Amino acid sequence: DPVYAEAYVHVNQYDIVLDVLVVNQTSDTLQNCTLELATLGDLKLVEKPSPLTLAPHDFANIKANVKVASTENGIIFGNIVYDVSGAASDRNCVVLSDIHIDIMDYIQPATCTDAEFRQMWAEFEWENKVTVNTNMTDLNDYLQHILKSTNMKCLTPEKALSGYCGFMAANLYARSIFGEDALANVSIEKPVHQGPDAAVTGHIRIRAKSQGMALSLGDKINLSQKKTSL
């Protein structure tokens, strides 16, 4: 419509913030509908610019701050239905459920003593694993990339050698914003001429408390793993 509203999400530092362009290229501060607040996850949405005019030929920035540490809603991965309403110069609108709400980001790296670790590794919520196998790179650059992407930790090296092969299994740990600790041992082949690694066939073993997020994390990482057309 003249009124075209375009919007995307910007998550700028904790705060997932809503860029909205409602552009009302309308022929007037056309009447506007209705909007509703809610508890969200460890967030709650929390602002609406008050008016409801769709000012003529006019462009507007409508900001929604979201509250990023509260409102539990357990509708995982978000993907929760959201409403913009048809309630005034509007007969309809958008009701939307979100998608676009993923993990790789959330968790931060976190750390451990290795013996205890091992013991723990085994000990943890075993229940998820996903496989590493396939890419576009060596796990040097590739590993770094993935690491940065998820913002997460590989705890320690043994020099055995991530180079000549290595035939290295890398142990990774991370802790998030709402505090889950997640453990990995992924054991991986690694690039190098007619030696081995341009796939893996390494297994990524994922432990996160619910299997459902945990595996999903293994996936998420799987998405993360490579670089291709989303």
Partner: protein
């Protein structure tokens, strides 16, 4: 047969196992399906449970039906007259008709085995592994692939002991080095001085033989991977020290034998 075919003589079960022998002749076999289907279906009567395994076995089966059964089994096996024991017997038979052979089945089975599980597979494993060796199975790459992976996340240290020992001998006659290494590292990965230890011991037959790339590197590796933890330190040191002590070529010859 028919007359018995529902526990008149709950006797009927035993017979199929041998007493009245079956391994069929070709049209003859097709005819057999119905009777086995009754037992297979009924799922009850200790006499029944046993019967199901022998009849099905003797007469043999299509792949497809197995599938239906795998689910059936999924519930059944735990106790359903205490199915597990008949089943272990059944299983022992399974390992035999396919002891790492129809590997696709072996894997399907493997997935399933682990899966349907309980725990009770382990016992079975003792047999299964043995079967695979008996063939001296050759879709190992795959077979092994399943084993390796699953076992990892199918646990039990005890299994590892056995398999280790076997593996210990086998090495580079079956190649696929990077993978195999890849595995091996993992096996060690686990704690236990003890768990760790096996990868080195298996290795001696292996190392000595070397494979599609190994001698140079074989020499490089023991260096690259090294450990403290005292007696664990010692294990690294000692193997080394032992290594230290003989011309590694000689070293290999004496020790290996």
């Amino acid at each position: 047969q028919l007359f018995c075919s529902s526990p008149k003589a709950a006797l009927r079960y035993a017979a199929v196992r041998t007493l009245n022998k079956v391994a069929m002749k070709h049209p003859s076999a097709v005819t057999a399906c119905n009777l086995d289907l009754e037992n297979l279906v009924t799922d009850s009567n200790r006499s029944i449970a046993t019967l199901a395994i022998t009849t099905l076995l003797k007469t043999g089966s299509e792949s497809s039906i197995d599938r239906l059964m795998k689910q059936i089994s999924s519930f059944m096996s735990e106790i359903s007259d205490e199915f597990k024991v008949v089943v272990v017997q059944a299983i022992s038979a399974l390992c035999q008709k396919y002891p790492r052979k129809h590997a696709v089945l072996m894997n399907f089975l493997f997935t399933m085995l682990r899966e349907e599980g309980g725990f009770e597979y382990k016992r079975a494993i003792v047999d299964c592994i043995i079967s695979i060796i008996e063939e001296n199975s050759e879709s190992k790459e795959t077979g092994l692939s399943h084993l390796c992976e699953f076992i990892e996340d199918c646990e039990f240290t005890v299994l590892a002991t056995r398999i280790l020992h076997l593996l210990g001998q086998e090495g580079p006659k079956t190649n696929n080095p990077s993978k195999y290494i890849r595995f091996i590292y993992n096996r060690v990965v686990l704690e236990h001085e003890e768990v760790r230890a096996g990868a080195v011991s298996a290795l001696a037959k292996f190392g000595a033989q070397n494979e599609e790339m190994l001698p140079s590197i074989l020499v490089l590796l023991k260096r690259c991977v090294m450990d403290d933890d005292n007696e664990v330190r010692d294990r690294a040191t000692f193997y080394l020290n032992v290594l230290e002590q003989k011309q590694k070529a000689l070293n290999a010859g004496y020790i290996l034998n």
